[PDB]
Design an enzyme around this catalytic site. Structure first.
Site, PDB file in Angstrom:
ATOM      1  N   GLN A   1       0.835  -1.193   0.000  1.00  0.00           N
ATOM      2  CA  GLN A   1       0.000   0.000   0.000  1.00  0.00           C
ATOM      3  C   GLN A   1       0.870   1.243   0.000  1.00  0.00           C
ATOM      4  OE1 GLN A   1      -2.596  -0.578   3.320  1.00  0.00           O
ATOM      5  NE2 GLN A   1      -3.813  -2.169   2.295  1.00  0.00           N
ATOM      6  N   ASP A   2       1.341   1.666   1.163  1.00  0.00           N
ATOM      7  CA  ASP A   2       2.219   2.824   1.213  1.00  0.00           C
ATOM      8  C   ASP A   2       3.470   2.499   2.036  1.00  0.00           C
ATOM      9  OD1 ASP A   2       0.693   2.860   3.608  1.00  0.00           O
ATOM     10  OD2 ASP A   2       0.784   5.059   3.716  1.00  0.00           O
ATOM     11  N   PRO A   3       4.542   3.282   1.873  1.00  0.00           N
ATOM     12  CA  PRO A   3       5.759   2.996   2.631  1.00  0.00           C
ATOM     13  C   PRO A   3       5.590   3.116   4.130  1.00  0.00           C
ATOM     14  CG  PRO A   3       5.877   5.159   1.732  1.00  0.00           C
ATOM     15  CD  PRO A   3       4.695   4.515   1.081  1.00  0.00           C
TER      16      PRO A   3
END
Lengths: 82, 223
Positions: B59-61
């Site tokens: 998804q996101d870092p």
């Protein structure tokens, strides 16, 4: 912050390692209650007890506390509505 | 078939410049963002277009100091294995012969073998999860998956969680191998991820196509 809410309910000081986004349908099964919007599962590990403390909140930037889930070395959750 | 070749026209898009400019502006204004600007496009750096064999979406870092470094799921050396990656490990141990749980979460060796470890949102504001969504990265990563579906053939996609699964809509399922399952997050691993056998199924699809399988045991570079 979110880390305090974890310490507020459990008394354990932990660092959040990941925050996994989850749609209403996904967390509906496990929790047994469908959330109004997308949920962020804030996960922290506590090697002291081999448990996984997950703080579920609404999406950014509100991060409204929704529930607290604790999973043990048997993959069994102890759900607590917030 | 390189990224600079297929993504060149996309780099020009107004929405794309808007995104990089917003991120850059925030960095300039004292807003710490992960990973460092130098690592935002590492996934493409490590895995070129013709080399993509497996695509694993994140998804996101990670929003914590020193965790993220441009690859999905992967954390730098010295960082504790995040819960999800841990569950990815537990499934690999159970299914891949010769696999023993590692002591780190650095997955550069996967990327080197053709595993595009791509996050759908390439940045995040330090401390605040999912802070850079609906900001343009999704459109970009949508095109990237569209480009793979288009110029390539036989790539096996590993879509975990409903969010990731939505990106299978732009992938021809007869042209590419798409494997769906729930997220490896502790909360959802027990409803379909454990026992999904995605890793072994991925290699079987790669061998039945002439390609060399992935060695899922990650390695640490010296010093």
């Amino acid at each position: 912050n979110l880390s305090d809410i974890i310490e507020k309910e459990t008394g354990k000081q932990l660092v959040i390692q990941e925050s996994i986004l989850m749609l209403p349908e996904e967390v509906e099964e496990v929790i047994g209650n469908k959330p109004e919007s997308d949920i962020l599962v804030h996960t922290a590990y506590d090697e002291s007890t081999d448990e996984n403390v997950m703080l579920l909140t609404s999406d950014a930037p509100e991060y409204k506390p929704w529930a607290l889930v604790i999973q043990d070395s048997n993959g069994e959750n102890k759900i607590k509505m917030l | 078939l390189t990224w600079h070749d297929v993504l060149a026209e996309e780099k020009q898009q107004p929405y794309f410049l808007n995104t990089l400019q917003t991120v850059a502006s925030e960095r300039q204004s004292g807003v710490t963002i992960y990973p460092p600007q130098k690592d935002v496009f590492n996934a493409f750096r490590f895995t070129e277009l013709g080399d993509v064999k497996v695509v694993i979406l994140g998804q996101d870092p990670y929003h914590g100091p020193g965790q993220a470094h441009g690859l999905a799921f992967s954390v730098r050396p010295g960082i504790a294995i995040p819960p999800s990656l841990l569950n990815m490990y537990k499934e690999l141990e159970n299914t891949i012969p010769g696999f023993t749980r590692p002591n780190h979460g650095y997955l550069e060796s996967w990327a080197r073998q053709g595993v595009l470890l791509l996050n759908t949102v390439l940045t995040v504001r330090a401390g605040q999860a999912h802070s850079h969504a609906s900001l343009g990265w999704e459109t970009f990563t949508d095109k990237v998956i569209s480009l793979i579906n288009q110029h390539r053939e036989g790539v096996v996609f590993l879509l975990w969680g409903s969010h990731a699964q939505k990106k299978g809509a732009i992938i021809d399922k007869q042209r590419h191998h798409v494997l769906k399952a729930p997220d490896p997050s502790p909360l959802s691993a027990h409803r379909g991820f454990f026992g999904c056998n995605h890793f072994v199924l991925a290699n079987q699809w790669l061998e039945q196509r002439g390609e060399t399988p992935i060695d899922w045991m990650p390695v640490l570079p010296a010093e």
